[PDB]
PDB file of all heavy atoms in Angstrom:
ATOM      1  N   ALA A  98       2.782 -22.499  14.657  1.00 47.06           N
ATOM      2  CA  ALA A  98       2.821 -23.671  13.657  1.00 47.06           C
ATOM      3  C   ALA A  98       2.155 -23.156  12.309  1.00 47.06           C
ATOM      4  O   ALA A  98       1.180 -22.479  12.362  1.00 47.06           O
ATOM      5  CB  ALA A  98       2.077 -24.841  14.175  1.00 47.06           C
ATOM      6  N   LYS A  99       2.841 -23.534  11.224  1.00 48.58           N
ATOM      7  CA  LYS A  99       2.287 -23.344   9.955  1.00 48.58           C
ATOM      8  C   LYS A  99       2.220 -24.654   9.139  1.00 48.58           C
ATOM      9  O   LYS A  99       3.336 -25.295   8.871  1.00 48.58           O
ATOM     10  CB  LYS A  99       3.084 -22.328   9.122  1.00 48.58           C
ATOM     11  CG  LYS A  99       3.134 -20.959   9.855  1.00 48.58           C
ATOM     12  CD  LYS A  99       3.905 -19.914   8.968  1.00 48.58           C
ATOM     13  CE  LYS A  99       3.056 -19.268   7.893  1.00 48.58           C
ATOM     14  NZ  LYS A  99       3.607 -17.952   7.427  1.00 48.58           N
ATOM     15  N   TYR A 100       1.027 -25.239   8.986  1.00 48.62           N
ATOM     16  CA  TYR A 100       0.852 -26.593   8.446  1.00 48.62           C
ATOM     17  C   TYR A 100       0.829 -26.512   6.957  1.00 48.62           C
ATOM     18  O   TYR A 100       0.409 -25.471   6.267  1.00 48.62           O
ATOM     19  CB  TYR A 100      -0.435 -27.224   9.043  1.00 48.62           C
ATOM     20  CG  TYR A 100      -0.295 -27.667  10.421  1.00 48.62           C
ATOM     21  CD1 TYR A 100      -0.314 -26.841  11.553  1.00 48.62           C
ATOM     22  CD2 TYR A 100       0.017 -29.045  10.731  1.00 48.62           C
ATOM     23  CE1 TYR A 100      -0.190 -27.334  12.828  1.00 48.62           C
ATOM     24  CE2 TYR A 100       0.215 -29.539  11.986  1.00 48.62           C
ATOM     25  CZ  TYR A 100       0.066 -28.627  13.034  1.00 48.62           C
ATOM     26  OH  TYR A 100       0.295 -29.062  14.354  1.00 48.62           O
ATOM     27  N   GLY A 101       1.143 -27.671   6.292  1.00 47.21           N
ATOM     28  CA  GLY A 101       1.090 -27.785   4.883  1.00 47.21           C
ATOM     29  C   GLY A 101      -0.318 -27.776   4.319  1.00 47.21           C
ATOM     30  O   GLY A 101      -1.279 -27.784   5.029  1.00 47.21           O
ATOM     31  N   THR A 102      -0.299 -27.900   2.929  1.00 46.20           N
ATOM     32  CA  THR A 102      -1.633 -27.746   2.236  1.00 46.20           C
ATOM     33  C   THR A 102      -2.565 -28.839   2.465  1.00 46.20           C
ATOM     34  O   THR A 102      -3.764 -28.718   2.266  1.00 46.20           O
ATOM     35  CB  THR A 102      -1.470 -27.406   0.691  1.00 46.20           C
ATOM     36  OG1 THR A 102      -0.778 -28.633   0.186  1.00 46.20           O
ATOM     37  CG2 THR A 102      -0.564 -26.218   0.496  1.00 46.20           C
ATOM     38  N   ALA A 103      -2.110 -30.021   2.972  1.00 48.48           N
ATOM     39  CA  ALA A 103      -3.052 -31.068   3.331  1.00 48.48           C
ATOM     40  C   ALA A 103      -3.982 -30.675   4.496  1.00 48.48           C
ATOM     41  O   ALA A 103      -5.071 -31.261   4.673  1.00 48.48           O
ATOM     42  CB  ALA A 103      -2.343 -32.389   3.736  1.00 48.48           C
ATOM     43  N   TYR A 104      -3.671 -29.635   5.170  1.00 46.98           N
ATOM     44  CA  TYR A 104      -4.337 -29.228   6.375  1.00 46.98           C
ATOM     45  C   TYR A 104      -5.202 -27.895   6.186  1.00 46.98           C
ATOM     46  O   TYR A 104      -5.572 -27.227   7.061  1.00 46.98           O
ATOM     47  CB  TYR A 104      -3.404 -29.032   7.610  1.00 46.98           C
ATOM     48  CG  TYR A 104      -2.597 -30.303   7.723  1.00 46.98           C
ATOM     49  CD1 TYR A 104      -1.291 -30.382   7.276  1.00 46.98           C
ATOM     50  CD2 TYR A 104      -3.105 -31.423   8.390  1.00 46.98           C
ATOM     51  CE1 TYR A 104      -0.527 -31.535   7.361  1.00 46.98           C
ATOM     52  CE2 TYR A 104      -2.423 -32.599   8.440  1.00 46.98           C
ATOM     53  CZ  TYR A 104      -1.100 -32.680   8.080  1.00 46.98           C
ATOM     54  OH  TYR A 104      -0.349 -33.865   8.207  1.00 46.98           O
ATOM     55  N   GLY A 105      -5.231 -27.511   4.890  1.00 46.79           N
ATOM     56  CA  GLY A 105      -5.893 -26.254   4.591  1.00 46.79           C
ATOM     57  C   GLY A 105      -4.985 -25.301   3.840  1.00 46.79           C
ATOM     58  O   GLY A 105      -3.812 -25.526   3.776  1.00 46.79           O
ATOM     59  N   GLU A 106      -5.566 -24.229   3.252  1.00 49.92           N
ATOM     60  CA  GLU A 106      -4.848 -23.224   2.528  1.00 49.92           C
ATOM     61  C   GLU A 106      -3.992 -22.508   3.421  1.00 49.92           C
ATOM     62  O   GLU A 106      -4.265 -22.184   4.600  1.00 49.92           O
ATOM     63  CB  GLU A 106      -5.866 -22.340   1.828  1.00 49.92           C
ATOM     64  CG  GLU A 106      -6.566 -22.935   0.625  1.00 49.92           C
ATOM     65  CD  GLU A 106      -7.160 -21.985  -0.294  1.00 49.92           C
ATOM     66  OE1 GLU A 106      -6.779 -20.805  -0.152  1.00 49.92           O
ATOM     67  OE2 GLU A 106      -7.981 -22.350  -1.203  1.00 49.92           O
ATOM     68  N   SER A 107      -2.817 -22.122   2.897  1.00 51.05           N
ATOM     69  CA  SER A 107      -1.733 -21.410   3.563  1.00 51.05           C
ATOM     70  C   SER A 107      -1.504 -20.107   2.761  1.00 51.05           C
ATOM     71  O   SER A 107      -1.236 -20.276   1.474  1.00 51.05           O
ATOM     72  CB  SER A 107      -0.520 -22.195   3.705  1.00 51.05           C
ATOM     73  OG  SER A 107       0.437 -21.559   4.487  1.00 51.05           O
ATOM     74  N   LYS A 108      -1.575 -18.995   3.347  1.00 53.32           N
ATOM     75  CA  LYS A 108      -1.398 -17.720   2.632  1.00 53.32           C
ATOM     76  C   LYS A 108      -0.263 -16.880   3.015  1.00 53.32           C
ATOM     77  O   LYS A 108       0.200 -16.994   4.200  1.00 53.32           O
ATOM     78  CB  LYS A 108      -2.778 -16.894   2.690  1.00 53.32           C
ATOM     79  CG  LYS A 108      -2.819 -15.789   1.617  1.00 53.32           C
ATOM     80  CD  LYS A 108      -4.223 -15.285   1.413  1.00 53.32           C
ATOM     81  CE  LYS A 108      -5.146 -16.300   0.736  1.00 53.32           C
ATOM     82  NZ  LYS A 108      -6.440 -15.771   0.310  1.00 53.32           N
ATOM     83  N   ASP A 109       0.249 -16.091   2.099  1.00 51.97           N
ATOM     84  CA  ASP A 109       1.434 -15.219   2.339  1.00 51.97           C
ATOM     85  C   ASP A 109       1.010 -13.959   3.014  1.00 51.97           C
ATOM     86  O   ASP A 109      -0.131 -13.474   2.677  1.00 51.97           O
ATOM     87  CB  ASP A 109       2.114 -14.873   0.992  1.00 51.97           C
ATOM     88  CG  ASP A 109       2.576 -16.087   0.215  1.00 51.97           C
ATOM     89  OD1 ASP A 109       3.690 -16.612   0.499  1.00 51.97           O
ATOM     90  OD2 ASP A 109       1.786 -16.520  -0.671  1.00 51.97           O
ATOM     91  N   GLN A 110       1.852 -13.443   3.902  1.00 52.01           N
ATOM     92  CA  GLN A 110       1.647 -12.069   4.345  1.00 52.01           C
ATOM     93  C   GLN A 110       2.100 -11.125   3.237  1.00 52.01           C
ATOM     94  O   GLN A 110       2.896 -11.514   2.398  1.00 52.01           O
ATOM     95  CB  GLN A 110       2.441 -11.784   5.536  1.00 52.01           C
ATOM     96  CG  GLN A 110       1.930 -12.438   6.773  1.00 52.01           C
ATOM     97  CD  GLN A 110       2.779 -12.252   8.044  1.00 52.01           C
ATOM     98  OE1 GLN A 110       4.014 -11.932   7.943  1.00 52.01           O
ATOM     99  NE2 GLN A 110       2.161 -12.333   9.231  1.00 52.01           N
ATOM    100  N   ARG A 111       1.634  -9.885   3.175  1.00 52.09           N
ATOM    101  CA  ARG A 111       2.355  -8.844   2.441  1.00 52.09           C
ATOM    102  C   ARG A 111       3.610  -8.439   3.151  1.00 52.09           C
ATOM    103  O   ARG A 111       3.779  -8.556   4.293  1.00 52.09           O
ATOM    104  CB  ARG A 111       1.441  -7.655   2.366  1.00 52.09           C
ATOM    105  CG  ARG A 111       0.113  -7.848   1.489  1.00 52.09           C
ATOM    106  CD  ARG A 111      -0.623  -6.525   1.133  1.00 52.09           C
ATOM    107  NE  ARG A 111      -1.011  -5.953   2.409  1.00 52.09           N
ATOM    108  CZ  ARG A 111      -1.434  -4.648   2.462  1.00 52.09           C
ATOM    109  NH1 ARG A 111      -1.431  -3.905   1.344  1.00 52.09           N
ATOM    110  NH2 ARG A 111      -1.816  -4.175   3.626  1.00 52.09           N
ATOM    111  N   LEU A 112       4.587  -7.953   2.253  1.00 51.76           N
ATOM    112  CA  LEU A 112       5.706  -7.348   2.803  1.00 51.76           C
ATOM    113  C   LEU A 112       5.397  -6.156   3.684  1.00 51.76           C
ATOM    114  O   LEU A 112       4.489  -5.419   3.308  1.00 51.76           O
ATOM    115  CB  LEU A 112       6.676  -6.913   1.677  1.00 51.76           C
ATOM    116  CG  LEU A 112       7.478  -7.981   1.018  1.00 51.76           C
ATOM    117  CD1 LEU A 112       8.266  -7.396  -0.234  1.00 51.76           C
ATOM    118  CD2 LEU A 112       8.401  -8.735   1.859  1.00 51.76           C
ATOM    119  N   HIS A 113       6.064  -6.051   4.814  1.00 50.32           N
ATOM    120  CA  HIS A 113       5.743  -5.019   5.758  1.00 50.32           C
ATOM    121  C   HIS A 113       6.970  -4.685   6.637  1.00 50.32           C
ATOM    122  O   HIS A 113       7.900  -5.464   6.665  1.00 50.32           O
ATOM    123  CB  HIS A 113       4.522  -5.395   6.660  1.00 50.32           C
ATOM    124  CG  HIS A 113       4.844  -6.604   7.434  1.00 50.32           C
ATOM    125  ND1 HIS A 113       4.719  -7.909   7.002  1.00 50.32           N
ATOM    126  CD2 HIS A 113       5.169  -6.729   8.796  1.00 50.32           C
ATOM    127  CE1 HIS A 113       4.904  -8.773   7.944  1.00 50.32           C
ATOM    128  NE2 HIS A 113       5.266  -8.056   9.044  1.00 50.32           N
ATOM    129  N   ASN A 114       6.857  -3.583   7.287  1.00 50.34           N
ATOM    130  CA  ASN A 114       7.833  -3.361   8.457  1.00 50.34           C
ATOM    131  C   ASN A 114       7.073  -3.599   9.777  1.00 50.34           C
ATOM    132  O   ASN A 114       5.918  -3.479   9.910  1.00 50.34           O
ATOM    133  CB  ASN A 114       8.482  -2.006   8.433  1.00 50.34           C
ATOM    134  CG  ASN A 114       7.518  -0.904   8.804  1.00 50.34           C
ATOM    135  OD1 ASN A 114       7.220  -0.734  10.026  1.00 50.34           O
ATOM    136  ND2 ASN A 114       7.033  -0.099   7.794  1.00 50.34           N
ATOM    137  N   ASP A 115       7.849  -3.873  10.876  1.00 51.87           N
ATOM    138  CA  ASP A 115       7.387  -3.990  12.178  1.00 51.87           C
ATOM    139  C   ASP A 115       8.083  -2.987  13.061  1.00 51.87           C
ATOM    140  O   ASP A 115       8.625  -3.271  14.138  1.00 51.87           O
ATOM    141  CB  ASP A 115       7.533  -5.375  12.752  1.00 51.87           C
ATOM    142  CG  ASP A 115       6.490  -6.297  12.304  1.00 51.87           C
ATOM    143  OD1 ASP A 115       5.261  -5.988  12.536  1.00 51.87           O
ATOM    144  OD2 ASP A 115       6.712  -7.278  11.606  1.00 51.87           O
ATOM    145  N   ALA A 116       8.257  -1.712  12.569  1.00 51.76           N
ATOM    146  CA  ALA A 116       8.890  -0.604  13.214  1.00 51.76           C
ATOM    147  C   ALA A 116       7.972   0.028  14.261  1.00 51.76           C
ATOM    148  O   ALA A 116       8.500   0.704  15.106  1.00 51.76           O
ATOM    149  CB  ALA A 116       9.347   0.378  12.266  1.00 51.76           C
ATOM    150  N   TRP A 117       6.746  -0.205  14.203  1.00 52.94           N
ATOM    151  CA  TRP A 117       5.693   0.501  14.993  1.00 52.94           C
ATOM    152  C   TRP A 117       5.293  -0.272  16.247  1.00 52.94           C
ATOM    153  O   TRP A 117       5.307  -1.503  16.284  1.00 52.94           O
ATOM    154  CB  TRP A 117       4.391   0.626  14.074  1.00 52.94           C
ATOM    155  CG  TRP A 117       4.499   1.596  12.949  1.00 52.94           C
ATOM    156  CD1 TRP A 117       4.978   1.238  11.727  1.00 52.94           C
ATOM    157  CD2 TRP A 117       4.090   2.917  12.902  1.00 52.94           C
ATOM    158  NE1 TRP A 117       4.942   2.368  10.932  1.00 52.94           N
ATOM    159  CE2 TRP A 117       4.327   3.422  11.668  1.00 52.94           C
ATOM    160  CE3 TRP A 117       3.512   3.732  13.917  1.00 52.94           C
ATOM    161  CZ2 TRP A 117       4.084   4.734  11.269  1.00 52.94           C
ATOM    162  CZ3 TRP A 117       3.172   5.025  13.508  1.00 52.94           C
ATOM    163  CH2 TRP A 117       3.522   5.498  12.247  1.00 52.94           C
ATOM    164  N   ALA A 118       4.940   0.581  17.266  1.00 54.89           N
ATOM    165  CA  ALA A 118       4.222   0.078  18.314  1.00 54.89           C
ATOM    166  C   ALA A 118       2.741  -0.191  17.972  1.00 54.89           C
ATOM    167  O   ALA A 118       2.193   0.286  17.031  1.00 54.89           O
ATOM    168  CB  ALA A 118       4.176   1.052  19.502  1.00 54.89           C
ATOM    169  N   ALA A 119       2.023  -1.132  18.677  1.00 54.92           N
ATOM    170  CA  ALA A 119       0.710  -1.534  18.260  1.00 54.92           C
ATOM    171  C   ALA A 119      -0.210  -0.433  18.176  1.00 54.92           C
ATOM    172  O   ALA A 119      -1.190  -0.492  17.334  1.00 54.92           O
ATOM    173  CB  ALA A 119       0.200  -2.609  19.311  1.00 54.92           C
ATOM    174  N   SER A 120      -0.113   0.567  19.075  1.00 60.78           N
ATOM    175  CA  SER A 120      -1.048   1.724  19.120  1.00 60.78           C
ATOM    176  C   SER A 120      -0.748   2.781  17.999  1.00 60.78           C
ATOM    177  O   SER A 120      -1.535   3.661  17.862  1.00 60.78           O
ATOM    178  CB  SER A 120      -0.943   2.477  20.412  1.00 60.78           C
ATOM    179  OG  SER A 120       0.412   2.904  20.571  1.00 60.78           O
ATOM    180  N   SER A 121       0.334   2.599  17.300  1.00 60.39           N
ATOM    181  CA  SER A 121       0.796   3.732  16.418  1.00 60.39           C
ATOM    182  C   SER A 121       0.831   5.090  17.040  1.00 60.39           C
ATOM    183  O   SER A 121       0.593   6.060  16.365  1.00 60.39           O
ATOM    184  CB  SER A 121      -0.044   3.706  15.151  1.00 60.39           C
ATOM    185  OG  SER A 121       0.033   2.500  14.484  1.00 60.39           O
ATOM    186  N   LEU A 122       1.127   5.267  18.381  1.00 59.88           N
ATOM    187  CA  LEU A 122       0.897   6.452  19.054  1.00 59.88           C
ATOM    188  C   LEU A 122       1.807   7.572  18.460  1.00 59.88           C
ATOM    189  O   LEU A 122       1.292   8.654  18.269  1.00 59.88           O
ATOM    190  CB  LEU A 122       1.173   6.279  20.525  1.00 59.88           C
ATOM    191  CG  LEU A 122       0.751   7.540  21.346  1.00 59.88           C
ATOM    192  CD1 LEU A 122      -0.802   7.503  21.543  1.00 59.88           C
ATOM    193  CD2 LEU A 122       1.425   7.605  22.722  1.00 59.88           C
ATOM    194  N   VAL A 123       3.024   7.279  18.238  1.00 60.42           N
ATOM    195  CA  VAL A 123       3.963   8.187  17.506  1.00 60.42           C
ATOM    196  C   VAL A 123       4.695   7.389  16.419  1.00 60.42           C
ATOM    197  O   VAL A 123       4.854   6.136  16.537  1.00 60.42           O
ATOM    198  CB  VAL A 123       4.935   8.917  18.430  1.00 60.42           C
ATOM    199  CG1 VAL A 123       4.092   9.777  19.458  1.00 60.42           C
ATOM    200  CG2 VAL A 123       5.817   7.904  19.076  1.00 60.42           C
TER     201      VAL A 123
END
């Protein structure tokens, strides 16, 4: 869930890729 500004500040992510596994092993 992403709530509107009445429920607190909402911030943007930076642009990124999700090509990686969590460990970045290779």
Side-chain angles (χ1 to χ4, degrees):
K99 299 182 83 158
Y100 284 82
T102 61
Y104 309 99
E106 288 196 12
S107 187
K108 196 161 289 190
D109 301 276
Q110 294 179 331
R111 291 191 299 163
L112 285 175
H113 63 277
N114 75 72
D115 281 300
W117 289 84
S120 63
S121 304
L122 189 77
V123 297

